[PDB]
Amino acid sequence: MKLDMKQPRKQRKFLYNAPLHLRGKIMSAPLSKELREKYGVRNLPIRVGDKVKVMRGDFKGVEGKVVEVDLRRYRIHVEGVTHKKTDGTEVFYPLHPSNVMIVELNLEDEKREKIIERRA
Amino acid sequence: ARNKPFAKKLRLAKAAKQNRRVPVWVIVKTNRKVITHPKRRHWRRTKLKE
Amino acid sequence: MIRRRKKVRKLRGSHTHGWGCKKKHRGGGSKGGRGMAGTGKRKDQKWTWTIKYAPDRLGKRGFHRPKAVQYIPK
Amino acid sequence: MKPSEIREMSIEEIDKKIRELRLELAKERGVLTMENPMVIRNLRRDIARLLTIKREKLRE
Amino acid sequence: TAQTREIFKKLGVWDDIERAKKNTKIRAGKGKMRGRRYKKAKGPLIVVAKNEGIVQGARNHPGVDVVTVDNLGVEYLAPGTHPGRLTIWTKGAIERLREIYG
RNA sequence: GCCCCGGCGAGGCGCAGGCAGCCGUCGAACCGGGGAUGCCCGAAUGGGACCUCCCGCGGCUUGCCGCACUCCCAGUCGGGAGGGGGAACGCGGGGAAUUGAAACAUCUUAGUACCCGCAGGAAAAGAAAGCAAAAGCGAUGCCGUUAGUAGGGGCGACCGAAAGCGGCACAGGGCAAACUGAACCCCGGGCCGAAAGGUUCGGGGGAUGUGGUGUUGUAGGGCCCGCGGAGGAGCCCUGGGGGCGAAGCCGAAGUCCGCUGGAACGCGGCGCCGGAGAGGGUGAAAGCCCCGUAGGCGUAAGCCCCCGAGCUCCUGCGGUGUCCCUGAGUACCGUCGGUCGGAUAUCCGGCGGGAAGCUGGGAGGCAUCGGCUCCCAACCCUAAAUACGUCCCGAGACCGAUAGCGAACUAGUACCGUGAGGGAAAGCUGAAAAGCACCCCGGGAGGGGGGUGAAAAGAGCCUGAAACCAGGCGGCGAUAGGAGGGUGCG
């Protein structure tokens, strides 16, 4: 995108009302050194079957799989990152993807490989 | 018997349908924000424009 | 250079802002008419001022020639 | 219903199909007043798809 | 920028660059809503005769300004009305000042 | 919400945090381009409207097209134009009073408010019957000065220019007539072509003149003699290269080790990038976590440039002449009304008179006479420099929810008035709903024990002032006199 505006209200307006096809890139996560080396890429946008390691927060050191990506709210769900309700059922804690690191990719799709080849 | 014109009848029918309270699932979906709207009209209090 | 402050600042709390009784700072009656009213020729409230400080404001004297004919030499 | 499957067929099959779908929509709207609460929406949209494709076949 | 880093370490103004980095603050008041977060502090000024690369190279250091002699005004030399700014002159700028006499 | 072509690359189903479900990898949502459907009223138009609904004609085969008024071309067939809407800016007409003059009548307010008509993305103006004055300039429009000057004015209050000078931007063309006399234009069909546009039949115009010529100062043109015969600048795009021009692409470097904490973006220590230390987001103050940023990238249609491609309508120079022509209720005078700084010397209109017309005509601040200087009206077109912003973009010694637009929100909304018209209030849980499982009482709203959370911050939700109210604590409190205070001693 072309965000050259020193004005905070304009930045925040863009982010709150961004079209859907540009929110995947606002939801990008970094890669492990290993994949960084073997592919030549520093970050990629997040996807459901990816395996992630939590880097900041209460759930530190937890590895797990992505099971939900929500673009309206800018949050993801990760299996294993859960808290209990008063009654006792388990619900997911939502995370921002800039707090997680990708330690294993899910590549059963050609266009994501295209992304990689474009930016490596 | 009381002799209405058809177009006036249709406008009165719309005014009749308009007049109900907010649905409950809307309050739930919205997390108790939308709970009343500006067009509750009662036939003794506020008269319409025929 | 010398940047002194305005005196409305010092007159906060004065109640009349230097103008005297609370009845004296009103409209055109408080000036005796608007502008050069009353300087003579019909009314005379400022005729004393006219005869001290501004004679030859009322009346006419002389004639001017056109610029097409005026020559100013160096 | 998909437009590729609708483009293999003749205008008369398209017409028969619209008749059938309209009858279903009426029946469903009657029972609705009495399991997939989206039947009405998908039937509506299918009728629309058929009419579009019939018009574009005629204009040719 | 790294070359300029080394040069400035050798000439002895890196400490003022570091002061300017350290003394930058988030300001008080409603300026934060209008931009104007981050009052930024002033460091050294490089006066040059021509730009051939050095604006590129010195821009990004906190508090550093680069100017030609021909376009030199008083705010570059006395920020906040206060004189006495650390300034790196070139020999060609010195000669061109000789010419301009001012 | 239906279809297609491209892009993006996995989720999506408006504001809007629900129950059930569906669409999508056969490339969706979203973005760019293009199509389809598109009820009634409304200029509203087949004819009528006391209720945005009714009632008909035809002709073709229920399904279909056509049928308003005013006008042009026509012609008993048809082909065309107009009507309504638009914030501010634009052109042309009609035109007050409050007010000031310390009253008021000329004046001022004011060619203002408001009314009527007419256009566009800009409009209007515009190529000297001019400005000047012993020198000269050279179409129009805009900016700065000229200047509160010349001048107007109960010569009062007040009103009020231009030329010139310095700049921005530049550009000039065509009719009428004299001479010629059908050599001409338009519509349809048959052909050729990418096309510029040719050529044929059938019609409409035109001798009350279609086309050719020609467009200016003592001049220009025509005719008349003659020597010369570079209109060739434009237009069409089978071809062609370049460039502008997208949605869109790429874009550096720590989540390193201890303490605090619910959570590091903190403190202390150790490193790195920088043409990038603008701004924002992320569970606290982040150049190195993410978007971006500096800076490199590419691009279909659409558009500009030029090489080529095919094709067009009249043509110069020098001068002679008792030969012809060059705009009429017009120029000009008198009078009345309006208007202007325009004063005996501004412009507009009405009424009564009224020319010359190339051996001619006009202007030069009262009239007229004579000189000198400058020009040729009464017919037409014309870019750029300028004004505006109902829209979009960027920025800010602007406000920060009684502020700022009336409106931070389901606002010109609710609501009031027969109607013209008038017109509010109303922002904030938490990092995460984790939005209180379970037991006793109560008809119930609820109370009490227990739980979630760093914290109840419990939706009657950030902080949570004062006035006011209830209870608890302390001092006084039923023989007593001053605006509720001051000094001194208990």
* Chain A 31-60 residues in 7 Å CB range of strand F: 41-43, 45-48, 55-60
**Strand F and D48 CB separated by under 7 Å:** yes
**Strand F and A67 CB separated by under 7 Å:** no
**Strand F and A17 CB separated by under 7 Å:** no
User: Which DSSP state fits B42?
Assistant: -
For residue A92, which of A77, A102, A71 has the smallest C-alpha distance? A77
Residue identified by tokens 């009322």 is C58
**D-contacting chains (≥3 CB pairs under 8 Å):** none
CB atoms within 10 A of CB E11: 10
- Please tell me the distance in Å from E33's CA to the nearest CA on chain A: 7
Provide the token pair at A69: 């990506």
Residue A65 near residue A78 (C-beta atoms within 8 A):
yes
Distance between CA C59 and CA A120 in Å, rounded? 95
Distance between CA C12 and CA C6 in Å, rounded? 11
* Chain A 74-93 residues in 7 Å CB range of strand F: 83-88, 91, 93
Q: Write the CB contacts of C33 (distance below 8 Å, at least 6 apart in sequence).
A: C43, C45, C46
Query: Could you tell me the CA-to-CA distances from E49 to D55, E46, E53, E92 in Å, in that order?
Result: 75, 10, 12, 6
Residue D30 near residue D40 (C-beta atoms within 8 A):
no
Q: Nearest nucleotide, C1' to the C-alpha of C46? A: F102
Query: With the C-alpha atoms ordered C16, C17, C20, C22, is the resulting torsion angle positive or negative?
Result: negative
Which class for A52: exposed (0-12), middle (13-18), buried (19 or more C-beta within 10 A)?
buried
Report CB contact under 8 Å: A7, E33. Answer: no
Residue C34 near residue C28 (C-beta atoms within 8 A):
yes
Distance between CA E8 and CA E5 in Å, rounded? 5
What's the CA angle centered on C70, arms C65 and C73, to 5 degrees? 150
- In chain A, the residue whose alpha carbon lies closest to the alpha carbon of E33 is A8
Amino acid at A66: V
Q: Maximum distance among all alpha carbons in chain A?
A: 49
Q: Write the CB contacts of E4 (distance below 8 Å, at least 6 apart in sequence).
A: E54, E57, E58, E61
* Chain C 5-44 residues in 7 Å CB range of strand F: 28-29, 32-39, 41-43
Report CB contact under 8 Å: E33, A8. Answer: yes
